[model samples]
Every structure is written in C-alpha cells, then in structure tokens.
Target: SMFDLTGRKALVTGATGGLGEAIARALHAQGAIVGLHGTREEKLKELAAELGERIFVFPANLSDREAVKALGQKAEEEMGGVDILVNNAGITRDGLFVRMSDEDWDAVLTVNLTSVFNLTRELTHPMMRRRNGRIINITSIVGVTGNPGQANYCASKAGLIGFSKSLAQEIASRNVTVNCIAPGFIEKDAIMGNIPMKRMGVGADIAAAVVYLASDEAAYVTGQTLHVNGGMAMI
Candidate 1:
C-alpha cells in the first residue's frame, strides 16, 4: 500500500533500456501512468506495448536543452502532469582528463548534468504549484568515489548530488522531494572486487530504491542519496 502509485503520473528519461527500463516497469507495475523518454522510437514502442496501459513515449535529444525543454511540454501533453520525475539519461566518453577533447567533455557534461537542470527547471513550477512531487536523479557511485579516466563523468554525477541537495532544500516546504540514487557496478567481477557480498546488483535493485523514494512512504526522506551498491561503498 505504501508503494501504491495509483492516480499518479511519472516521467522517466532514458527509459528505453537497462536501469531506466527496469525503473519504468517498477513504477508502472505499481499503478503509475508513465511517460517514457528516449530517442529510440522502436524501444519506446516495445516498452509501451509490454507495459500495456498508461504508457506514453516522448522522443527528444537530451544533449540539447531546448529539445529537453520541449520534451516537458510534450510529456505534459502525453501524461497530463508529472508527480514523479526520474532523471536517468546520460552519456560517457571515457578517456584521460588531459587527453579528453573539449567536445567530449562538453558532450558528457551537457547530457549528464546540464540536461538535468534544463529538464528539472521546466517541471518544477508545475510540481511546486501542485505541492506534491518526487524528483529522483540517477547518479553513479563514482560521484562519491572518484574514478580514474572518467573525469567528465565524475564531475557531472558529483554535480548532480549538489544540484539535488540544493533543489531539495529550496522545495522541501512545497512538499517536493529531490533525491539521488547511486548504483554500483553491474559487472560481477567489478562488484566482487569491492562488495562483501561478492555479487553484482541487477536493475531491479535500483528500481526498488527508486520506487521507495518516489512513494509516500518516503515523505520525510529528501536531500539524500540512496546508494544501492551492496555495501561496496557505504557512507
């Protein structure tokens, strides 16, 4: 009952595959009308059909803030109003910081970080007016634990944390909660290298965390980061 999302609408970016796909399914299963955001029409269609009802797809380029701004209008058109927003879209150009081109660095930050600002800004006004909202930003474990050869990625993800916390503080009185979820490596070898469990986490693991944060059960929980890393990086 705490997980019930009936009569609620959600917009989840990058909902075409992997973690995004799983999160969408989890939200849908709990009775939420979901607007799936992606560039791939085919994948969106696939997930829509699988979900069977209350699924809408809005295609847009996350790297472009104007395009992302347009998506909020389109999402409202499709799903009506958003009660839960999941910022899951991201990109990566792995390389050493010195060797990283301005183009690559900009591309990653634009998609991973700036796009979040663009999207969140567009949606916040409506959410605040309604006095009910759940903003869940999908960051990475490396945001807290710096990684080599991923300076751009690390900066963007770390930026998301600060961004979420700041926004959460500003909007807490409006009953709009903003939070972050940092997932660990999916590869078993990589996970085993650090986690005491010696196992990898699947998409469902992160989905459960998202669902909890989005649900009314977590009303008092905000301005926080939920780490789903199997004790790999406990804070």
Candidate 2:
C-alpha cells in the first residue's frame, strides 16, 4: 500500500510556512484533519483559509512550555486527538560559538529541542493509550554532519534525534512509532542562496517523506532518520 490517512488527525507545528506547510497540506490531501501550528497568526490564518475546514490554525510560541502544552491540548480537543505529530518548529541563531550569547543558545535549544520534549512527552501518553500514533521530528542534516556557526542548532537537533530513538523504543510495544527527518540543503529560496547548489529542495519532497512515515504502511519503520537532501549531504 502507498499511504492512506483517512479519518486521521495530524498536528503539524510550524505549519504556517516552509516545509511544515507542505507536510500539513499533504496530510490534509490524504484525508487527515490537520492542526496547523505556528507563532505567526497571520500566516497561520492564511493557510487555514486556503485549507478550509480540513485545517485548524493554532498560533503558539513554541519556546514557551506552557503555550506548547496548551497548544497540544487544544489540538486534541479541536481535532479530536492527533494521530500524527510533526515537530517542525525551529529557528536558527547563526553565530560563531565564541560570539554566541547565552540567550541565543538557550532560545534555540528551547525552540528546537526542549519544545519537542515537552510536546511529545504530553502527547505520547494519550497515544500510548490509543496504541497507535506517529511522531515525526524535523531534524537537519547538520545534526548528522555538523556545520560551522550552527553549534546550538546542531546540538539541539542532534539531541532531538537521540530523544526520538529512545522514545521509539519505549513506545514500540504500544504500536506508536517515532522517527526523524534530516533534511539536507533543501531548495528554500532564502536558505538556498548560500548553498553550493544555489537551490534548496522543494517542499513537496519533504512532504512526501513525511506522509510516508506517518502512514500505516510505515508501521515497521521507527527510530530512523529519513534523509531528503538533494545530494548536498549524504549520510
């Protein structure tokens, strides 16, 4: 079977833009009700309008633990429990380690790493009871292969991968799978301009991979990282 998400509900964080939006759209196309999460209210509303009732807009500052927890609870209430959780909210503070401030380091770690910990920790208990769920973390190739001026980002993402692996093992018997997607130098216009390829990977490419991982067809696939880089980095 390819993939069928009929009647499922997916909560996709950071869905207002970039790869997160792509993931949400793909899941919605497969008949899943999508809760689109982002800090940008306007953008989230725009996406919600475009997606209609199939999508729910959730504006949240993921760096705040309380906000994320409430966001998860509200999503469950509005969407009637999330079958899939896509942890795609992230931010980058680019600066050499020597010049990185404590606030910068903490902010990146909070948004990129700790927020995932909090959301998944809260969401997984319900999923364990249901005995079926999929958790997908949007990691980066930099997590696998470190990058200069991105120590904080890399550490946070790398930590997420480790966290997913452990959680995958813990939830395996409950029929819930946890995984990570390590995107390489994808062709985002803003991000691609500095890359060697001078083009980032398309949103659809990452979306396809996300949809696959969340589908029943990938039941046996867990604790793994799917690399979707366009030959920019191979691991």
Candidate 3:
C-alpha cells in the first residue's frame, strides 16, 4: 500500500470522539502508534486500550495553552517524537456577528485555532530539526464559503488554512509537509437533507484522505486542502 504507516507515531488532538476518533482509528489501522489527546479521561483510556501497545492517552484541556504544550512535550517523550500530527480538535460558537459576545468569540477561537497554533508549534520543533514530519489539519468548507451566523467559526478555520500554507512553505524544503482537509456537513439527516450524494459522508472517508496525506506517497503534496464533502460544497 502506498499509504503504509508502519513506524509513524501520531499525536491526535480531539481524539476521543467524532472525526478525531475516526482519524486516530484509521491511523492505527494503518499501523501507526498514536498518542490520543482530549479533555476527558475515560474516553481517552477507552481509545488507548482499544488501540493497545504504543498507544498512549493524555488528558488535557486544549483551550489551555499550557496543557496543550504539556501534552505535546509528554507525547514527544513517550512516543520518541511524533512523525504525524493531526490537529483534529476544534469547537464552534455559532451566532450572528451582531449578537456574538466576546466570550463566545474567544472560546471558539481559542479551542479551534489558538490551540492548533500552540500544539503545532510545540511539536514542529523536532520535526523541523529532524527534517521529516506530516501535519494534517481539519478545517471546514464553511471557511471558504462563508456561512451565515458562523463568523467566528469561519474565521478560525480560514485562519488555519492560511497558517497551514505559510508553514507548509516554510518547511517544505525540510520534507515536513503541512496540509488540511475541509469536510462538509458530516452529521445526520437533519444536516444532510440539503446536500447531494444521497448520504452524509462518514469519518472513514475523511480518514482515508488523512492517512494518505500522512503517508510517504504524499511527500510532495503540501500546502493544500482536500475536500471530503459529498457534493455539499465544491472546492
């Protein structure tokens, strides 16, 4: 398989649920050891136990940059340094900009974007020094399409895309690739009624794309966004 990940070690944030869990599971299925991060201990333990040996769980509140930094440092030591980083953690505070409070905006931006910066910056130091790594961020199509009443959420995801491209360029020469996946409404019927493809896309679909980007085959692919929507949005 072109996407073989036998020896890669990954640190996946938001890994206890949803797309985060799916991404971790997919990477695990492909043979990479994973360091799971989340705010809850039980879920983290559940996943770690499921993935078994080489899989470790670190409970941290990503909203706290100190916790994020600590998670990165601890994961680095435990895993002997990470080869793949999935910044799959994010939160949304949806509301009309006119009605948005400082707290709402701050919360959304902190968890969705600031935490990404803190963790990535911490983990990338070793990656840059070693000249090898893969950083895949989970963004959203709303970032590009500009959805109504999602100003804060949109800004965060959009910021990630820009940040990713800038970082990708900075480290491309070192063989450390940075990329993103923008998934469209991936929830249930209430969310998918308006989209095409006759079904909501599953986590496995996004995971497939993620693992590919994390693999050696995608060494030349960087600073790009892969859209995994089922025709809900066009790239």
Candidate 4:
C-alpha cells in the first residue's frame, strides 16, 4: 500500500509528549525506523524501551541552536538520512498580550519556532538532495484563527503554517512535501456545536494524519494544512 513506510526513516520531535509519542508509534508501526526526540530523557528512553526495535531516542533542548543542529545531524547520520521530519516539539506560555513579558514571548518563539528553523535547515539539504522527503509540522487550531491569552502560542503556530507553505513551494520540485497539521482543541459546548463530528480530537487522530502525510500516498499533497479539528475551522 502507498501508506506502508517500510525502510523509511522518520524523526519526530517532542516524542515524549502525548501527541508526539503517538506520532512516533504510528510511524514506527507503519514500518519506519523512528527517531524519538525530546528533552525528557527518561520518558524518551521509556518509549524506546516500550517500542523495542527501530527506535532511536535523542534528547535535546530545542532552545539551544547548537543542540538543535546537532540533533538534526545526529538523526540524519544515525537513521542514514531522515526521510520524514516532524517538528512537533513546542511550548506554551499563556498570557494576555498586554501582560505578556518579553521573557515569555522570547522563550515561546525560540523553542517553538526558531528551533524548527534551525533543525529544518539542517535536514532540508539531505532531503532535497535525495530528491524525496516529507516535512510534517504540527501547528494548532488557534493558529488558523485567534485565541486570547495565548498570543505567543498562536504566533508560533501560525508562523509554522507560513513557514511550511514557503518551504513547501521551495522544495516541491524535489518530490518533498512540506505540510502542517493543525490539531483541534478538546473543547466545550460552543466548541462542540462548531465541530461537525461533535467530539474532541485525540492524539491518535493527529498521529494518523502524520502517518498519512509521511507516506508516499501523500506525494501529490504539499503546502497544505490538514486540520484534524472535527469540522470546527472549515478552512
């Protein structure tokens, strides 16, 4: 099947988090050798331990430029070049725009956006040269719309969407697709009404999207945002 990833190498950041881990598992289960990147060393290891074979645990602080570069290089070398890269590692500093400190804004941008730029820079060369790749960046539902008290998070996520589209256009000729998955909120009454499915999304929902995007099946799809938002944001 086009979705089978046998022999592909995938590197998923934030692999210790709920969504990240699910993405890792789904890719690995689909037959890709998965590199699990996270700051939580123990959790990464625990996941590797659970997954057993075809799993590589890479622990790094995404805020550190050198560390992010090293992670990219290491993943490429260890996995014999990453066929798929998922920039899923992100942090949130919820605060009203008026009260948001420079510290909070900087931290959020550095970890959530800048690190992606740094790491993707390192990986894109090989992917482009190899003439095949998939870059699945995890954005958020708020990124497509607006969310109060989360200016930093919204900015970073929206920035990722912009970044993905630009990069997607740049490398589409190389058969490398760049895309974003904007995950939905696990919300309430008003939200329930907005969602046509009338149910909240789970990590597995995002994971399945990741697996599909990473596969050869989605080769024709690029510069797109796949919203697993249960019909909330109909764009």
For TM-score, the strongest prediction is 1
For model 3, the stretches where C-alpha displacement exceeds 4 angstroms are 188-194
Q: What TM-score, computed on C-alpha atoms, does each candidate reach?
A: 0.97, 0.94, 0.96, 0.96
Candidate 1 clashing pairs?
none
* Residue 97, model 4, lDDT: 97
Candidates' C-alpha lDDT:
0.90, 0.89, 0.90, 0.93
- Tens-digit lDDT track of model 4 for 1-235: 7699989999999998889988999998999999999998999999999999999999999999999999999999988999999999999999889999999999999988999999999999899999999999999999989789989999999999999999999999999999999999742687788788889888889999999999998999999999999888988
Prediction 2 global C-alpha lDDT: 0.89
Model 2 residue runs over 4 Å out of place are 188-199
lDDT of 2 by residue, 51-86 (tens): 897788889999899998899888888888888999
Could you say which candidate leads in lDDT?
4
Candidate ranking (TM-score, best to worst) = 1, 4, 3, 2
Cα RMSD for candidates in order? 1.1, 2.4, 1.3, 1.3
lDDT of 1 at 79: 71
Off by over 4 Å in 1: 187-191
| Candidate with more favorable, higher lDDT: 1 or 4 | 4
The 10-residue segment of model 4 with minimum total lDDT is: 185-194
Count of backbone collisions within predicted model 2:
4
The TM-score of predicted model 4 comes to: 0.96
Candidate 4, position 80, lDDT: 96
